[PDB]
Design a protein around this motif. Structure first.
Motif, PDB file in Angstrom:
ATOM      1  N   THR A 191       0.796  -1.237   0.000  1.00  0.00           N
ATOM      2  CA  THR A 191       0.000   0.000   0.000  1.00  0.00           C
ATOM      3  C   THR A 191       0.831   1.291   0.000  1.00  0.00           C
ATOM      4  O   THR A 191       0.511   2.247  -0.716  1.00  0.00           O
ATOM      5  CB  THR A 191      -0.982   0.039   1.199  1.00  0.00           C
ATOM      6  N   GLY A 192       1.890   1.315   0.802  1.00  0.00           N
ATOM      7  CA  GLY A 192       2.760   2.489   0.898  1.00  0.00           C
ATOM      8  C   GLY A 192       3.678   2.742  -0.292  1.00  0.00           C
ATOM      9  O   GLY A 192       4.240   3.838  -0.404  1.00  0.00           O
ATOM     10  N   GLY A 193       3.824   1.747  -1.177  1.00  0.00           N
ATOM     11  CA  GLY A 193       4.807   1.778  -2.282  1.00  0.00           C
ATOM     12  C   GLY A 193       5.904   0.724  -2.145  1.00  0.00           C
ATOM     13  O   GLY A 193       5.705  -0.338  -1.538  1.00  0.00           O
ATOM     14  N   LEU A 194       7.076   1.026  -2.699  1.00  0.00           N
ATOM     15  CA  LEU A 194       8.216   0.112  -2.668  1.00  0.00           C
ATOM     16  C   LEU A 194       9.086   0.277  -1.441  1.00  0.00           C
ATOM     17  O   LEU A 194       9.956  -0.556  -1.198  1.00  0.00           O
ATOM     18  CB  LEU A 194       9.081   0.282  -3.919  1.00  0.00           C
ATOM     19  N   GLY A 195       8.877   1.348  -0.683  1.00  0.00           N
ATOM     20  CA  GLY A 195       9.631   1.586   0.534  1.00  0.00           C
ATOM     21  C   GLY A 195      11.053   2.060   0.287  1.00  0.00           C
ATOM     22  O   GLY A 195      11.948   1.728   1.056  1.00  0.00           O
ATOM     23  N   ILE A 196      11.260   2.843  -0.781  1.00  0.00           N
ATOM     24  CA  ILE A 196      12.543   3.487  -1.061  1.00  0.00           C
ATOM     25  C   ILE A 196      12.353   4.890  -1.557  1.00  0.00           C
ATOM     26  O   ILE A 196      11.284   5.252  -2.023  1.00  0.00           O
ATOM     27  CB  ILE A 196      13.377   2.731  -2.134  1.00  0.00           C
ATOM     28  N   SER A 197      13.424   5.669  -1.459  1.00  0.00           N
ATOM     29  CA  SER A 197      13.553   6.916  -2.207  1.00  0.00           C
ATOM     30  C   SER A 197      14.810   6.846  -3.047  1.00  0.00           C
ATOM     31  O   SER A 197      15.769   6.181  -2.664  1.00  0.00           O
ATOM     32  CB  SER A 197      13.589   8.143  -1.306  1.00  0.00           C
ATOM     33  N   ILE A 198      14.777   7.536  -4.185  1.00  0.00           N
ATOM     34  CA  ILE A 198      15.912   7.618  -5.074  1.00  0.00           C
ATOM     35  C   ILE A 198      16.388   9.058  -5.254  1.00  0.00           C
ATOM     36  O   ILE A 198      15.609  10.020  -5.199  1.00  0.00           O
ATOM     37  CB  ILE A 198      15.680   6.932  -6.439  1.00  0.00           C
ATOM     38  N   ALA A 199      17.690   9.174  -5.492  1.00  0.00           N
ATOM     39  CA  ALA A 199      18.348  10.456  -5.688  1.00  0.00           C
ATOM     40  C   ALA A 199      19.274  10.326  -6.895  1.00  0.00           C
ATOM     41  O   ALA A 199      19.763   9.241  -7.206  1.00  0.00           O
ATOM     42  CB  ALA A 199      19.168  10.843  -4.437  1.00  0.00           C
ATOM     43  N   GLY A 200      19.532  11.445  -7.553  1.00  0.00           N
ATOM     44  CA  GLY A 200      20.486  11.506  -8.649  1.00  0.00           C
ATOM     45  C   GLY A 200      19.832  11.412 -10.001  1.00  0.00           C
ATOM     46  O   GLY A 200      18.626  11.572 -10.130  1.00  0.00           O
ATOM     47  N   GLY A 201      20.647  11.166 -11.021  1.00  0.00           N
ATOM     48  CA  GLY A 201      20.185  11.167 -12.397  1.00  0.00           C
ATOM     49  C   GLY A 201      20.766  12.320 -13.178  1.00  0.00           C
ATOM     50  O   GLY A 201      21.127  13.350 -12.618  1.00  0.00           O
ATOM     51  N   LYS A 202      20.843  12.136 -14.486  1.00  0.00           N
ATOM     52  CA  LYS A 202      21.434  13.121 -15.384  1.00  0.00           C
ATOM     53  C   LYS A 202      20.693  14.462 -15.308  1.00  0.00           C
ATOM     54  O   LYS A 202      19.506  14.541 -15.573  1.00  0.00           O
ATOM     55  CB  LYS A 202      21.433  12.582 -16.821  1.00  0.00           C
ATOM     56  N   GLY A 203      21.426  15.515 -14.969  1.00  0.00           N
ATOM     57  CA  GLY A 203      20.845  16.852 -14.839  1.00  0.00           C
ATOM     58  C   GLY A 203      20.287  17.229 -13.474  1.00  0.00           C
ATOM     59  O   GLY A 203      19.880  18.381 -13.275  1.00  0.00           O
ATOM     60  N   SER A 204      20.273  16.275 -12.541  1.00  0.00           N
ATOM     61  CA  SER A 204      19.846  16.504 -11.161  1.00  0.00           C
ATOM     62  C   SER A 204      21.055  16.681 -10.274  1.00  0.00           C
ATOM     63  O   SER A 204      22.174  16.343 -10.644  1.00  0.00           O
ATOM     64  CB  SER A 204      19.121  15.270 -10.622  1.00  0.00           C
ATOM     65  N   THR A 205      20.830  17.176  -9.062  1.00  0.00           N
ATOM     66  CA  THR A 205      21.885  17.197  -8.066  1.00  0.00           C
ATOM     67  C   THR A 205      22.313  15.760  -7.794  1.00  0.00           C
ATOM     68  O   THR A 205      21.463  14.916  -7.541  1.00  0.00           O
ATOM     69  CB  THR A 205      21.383  17.850  -6.765  1.00  0.00           C
ATOM     70  N   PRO A 206      23.616  15.471  -7.894  1.00  0.00           N
ATOM     71  CA  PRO A 206      24.068  14.083  -7.672  1.00  0.00           C
ATOM     72  C   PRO A 206      23.961  13.633  -6.224  1.00  0.00           C
ATOM     73  O   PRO A 206      24.031  14.439  -5.296  1.00  0.00           O
ATOM     74  CB  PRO A 206      25.535  14.107  -8.106  1.00  0.00           C
ATOM     75  N   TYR A 207      23.802  12.334  -6.041  1.00  0.00           N
ATOM     76  CA  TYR A 207      23.814  11.738  -4.720  1.00  0.00           C
ATOM     77  C   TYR A 207      25.204  11.798  -4.083  1.00  0.00           C
ATOM     78  O   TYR A 207      25.334  11.966  -2.877  1.00  0.00           O
ATOM     79  CB  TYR A 207      23.379  10.279  -4.825  1.00  0.00           C
ATOM     80  N   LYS A 208      26.236  11.629  -4.899  1.00  0.00           N
ATOM     81  CA  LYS A 208      27.600  11.793  -4.432  1.00  0.00           C
ATOM     82  C   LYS A 208      28.431  12.369  -5.540  1.00  0.00           C
ATOM     83  O   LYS A 208      28.093  12.231  -6.710  1.00  0.00           O
ATOM     84  CB  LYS A 208      28.185  10.497  -3.885  1.00  0.00           C
ATOM     85  N   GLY A 209      29.519  13.022  -5.148  1.00  0.00           N
ATOM     86  CA  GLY A 209      30.268  13.917  -6.021  1.00  0.00           C
ATOM     87  C   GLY A 209      30.804  13.295  -7.281  1.00  0.00           C
ATOM     88  O   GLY A 209      30.798  13.926  -8.335  1.00  0.00           O
ATOM     89  N   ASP A 210      31.244  12.043  -7.183  1.00  0.00           N
ATOM     90  CA  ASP A 210      31.942  11.394  -8.304  1.00  0.00           C
ATOM     91  C   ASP A 210      31.034  10.575  -9.220  1.00  0.00           C
ATOM     92  O   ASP A 210      31.538   9.907 -10.127  1.00  0.00           O
ATOM     93  CB  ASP A 210      33.101  10.534  -7.781  1.00  0.00           C
ATOM     94  N   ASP A 211      29.714  10.637  -9.006  1.00  0.00           N
ATOM     95  CA  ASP A 211      28.776   9.840  -9.797  1.00  0.00           C
ATOM     96  C   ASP A 211      27.408  10.515  -9.911  1.00  0.00           C
ATOM     97  O   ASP A 211      26.724  10.734  -8.908  1.00  0.00           O
ATOM     98  CB  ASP A 211      28.644   8.469  -9.161  1.00  0.00           C
TER      99      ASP A 211
END
Length: 95
Positions: free
Chosen positions: A11-31
């Motif tokens: 019901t709540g979903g998959l139980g994760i959040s995602i960050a990053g992707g091309k053109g977004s603020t990166p999750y970590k500096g080198d990727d």
């Protein structure tokens, strides 16, 4: 470092959040890629073995390399009631 996991949507979903992707603020500096930035402790992804910091390589067999954030979100939302995730997981982090 590579794992294939299968998450059962609830019901709540998959139980994760995602960050990053091309053109977004990166999750970590080198990727600039898509990462799992949050895992609900009592949720479906946690039960399936997903861990915070996993790099999301595929969703239902579709590669996320070079993907924008929005397209990755759509893939997860459209992945059905059971979602196969292929991840790259660091055993440790060099500093």
């Amino acid at each position: 470092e590579e794992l294939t996991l299968t998450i059962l949507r609830q019901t709540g979903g998959l139980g994760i959040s995602i960050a990053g992707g091309k053109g977004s603020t990166p999750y970590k500096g080198d990727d600039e890629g898509i990462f799992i930035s949050r895992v609900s402790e009592e949720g479906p992804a946690a039960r399936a073995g997903v861990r915070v910091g996993d790099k999301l390589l595929e969703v239902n067999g579709v590669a996320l390399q070079g993907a924008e954030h929005h397209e990755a979100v759509e893939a997860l939302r459209g992945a059905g009631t059971a979602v196969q995730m292929r991840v790259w997981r660091e055993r440790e982090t060099s500093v």
